[PDB]
């Protein structure tokens, strides 16, 4: 089918004899000459140590969210390390994280138990999900968890770690409450520390060194990637090649991984927008990161 155009015509018609006429055999496409990768001039490594190497993780009721931005993030070392028992990515692929660029990455760190580790997932129902930490239905990112029994378990129990047990209403996704107001239930007779059908909202739990694996403390860090609709600030460890125009290339603008020929534009992008789409929702204009 590629020897000569007559043979391509014979292949298309599925016959070795063709009649007089003009036949639409195949399509002609200009193959790219080179591959272009253009990532921003950020060079400093991301402070992922301060999230995973943390001495103590914040409690689930009041977790810690860190703004990871303006740095080069290497997720290959995070995924390749065998320390993390659970490494589940929902909207992305863990091995594809080095080729992508994100405008902002947020890491939420908290400690839960083995029986509640499955509750950290989109569309889940449970104590942690309903009252402590709710993940969005359209959650894109990765969930990282590893055993902290060697880290947080103490003889007699570790009482620095708190989970909410009672709340008036379920939490919307990414909702944190630190009210610590006493729980009022029943006929609402509790206005103080203790009352009828009244309990403390923050139910502490102590982690024993010999406790069961399901009740062992688990350090959980979730990376909430928000994909590329604004200019990127945190990117993978991909080298940036020189920009070439007027030649068909496999351009990779902040992970856009398109293909086409690049020309100078007279279109004025607003400062907050970095991409330009069209009717078919295909990227028409891009702003060079460098």
């Amino acid at each position, epitope marked *: 089918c590629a020897l000569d155009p007559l043979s391509e015509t014979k292949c298309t018609l599925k016959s070795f004899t063709v009649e007089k006429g003009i036949y639409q055999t195949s399509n002609f496409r200009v193959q790219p000459t080179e591959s272009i990768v253009r990532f921003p001039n950020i060079t400093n490594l991301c402070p992922f140590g*301060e999230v995973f190497n943390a001495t103590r993780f914040a409690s689930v009721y009041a977790w810690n969210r860190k703004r990871i931005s303006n740095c080069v993030a290497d997720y290959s070392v995070l995924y390749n390390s065998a320390s993390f028992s659970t490494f589940k990515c929902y909207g992305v692929s863990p091995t594809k994280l080095n080729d992508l660029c994100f405008t902002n990455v947020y890491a939420d760190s908290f400690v839960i138990r083995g029986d509640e580790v499955r509750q950290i997932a989109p569309g889940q129902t449970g104590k942690i999900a309903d009252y402590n930490y709710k993940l969005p239905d359209d959650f894109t990112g990765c969930v990282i968890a590893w055993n902290s029994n*060697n880290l947080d378990s103490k003889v007699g129990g570790n009482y620095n770690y708190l989970y909410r047990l009672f709340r008036k209403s379920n939490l919307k996704p990414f909702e944190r409450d630190i009210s610590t107001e006493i729980y009022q239930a029943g006929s609402t007779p509790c206005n103080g520390v203790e009352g009828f059908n009244c309990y403390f909202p923050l139910q502490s739990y102590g982690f024993q060194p010999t406790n069961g694996v399901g009740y062992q403390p688990y350090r959980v860090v979730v990376l909430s990637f928000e994909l590329l609709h604004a200019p990127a600030t945190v990117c993978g460890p991909k080298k940036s090649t020189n920009l070439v125009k007027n030649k068909c290339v496999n351009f990779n603008f902040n992970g856009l991984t398109g293909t086409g020929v690049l020309t100078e534009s007279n279109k004025k992008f607003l400062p907050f927008q970095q991409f330009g789409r069209d009717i078919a929702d295909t990227t028409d204009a891009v702003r060079d990161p460098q």
Partner: antibody
Amino acid sequence: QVQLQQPGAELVKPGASVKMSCKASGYNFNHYWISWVKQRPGQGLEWIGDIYPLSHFTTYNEKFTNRATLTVDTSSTTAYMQLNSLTSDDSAVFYCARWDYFDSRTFDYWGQGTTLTVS
Amino acid sequence: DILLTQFPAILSVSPGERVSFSCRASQTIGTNIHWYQQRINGSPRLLIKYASESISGIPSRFSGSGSGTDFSLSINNVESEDIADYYCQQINSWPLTFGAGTKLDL
């Protein structure tokens, strides 16, 4: 009272291992971390590593991640570091401090200081 | 890896005055600085925990303030026993790091 015993002024030939002794008493040994700090004469303190006596979990500094290896004896409530290749530059004071974990992490109690020198 | 620096590496003070040190971290930590002192031929001793509150047995002159990245150590009154080496220690995440070094002069 709480007292941490640490002998010092030990003489060792360069290129040989040392077995530091860090005897601690006066507190529950399973509820507190104990750490080591290296200080050159006239220079700032430099971290070495930590340990969990209950679960024998250790973290090492990047410079000392392979040279210094740490072990703990729960029976004698004494921590140790050993199997290191000392050099002439390694001559420094080696402290042993108790890390107050599960609470205000403050390095509450410090040792006298093992002034190891080599020649 | 969090890095700490002190601009006043060596400081000269007079008895009875107030001075303040500085310790800025590479990354924000949120009050995870402990200030230590080491006298000549002595051992380090904890003075101020979490860079904000103090402990028992420490004179009230040693006052700590600061949050985020930049931290400071303030001493109300200077006497003969205040001449030592004051060190800044970050404890937010491993590896734990100590200060470059601050010295006091008469």
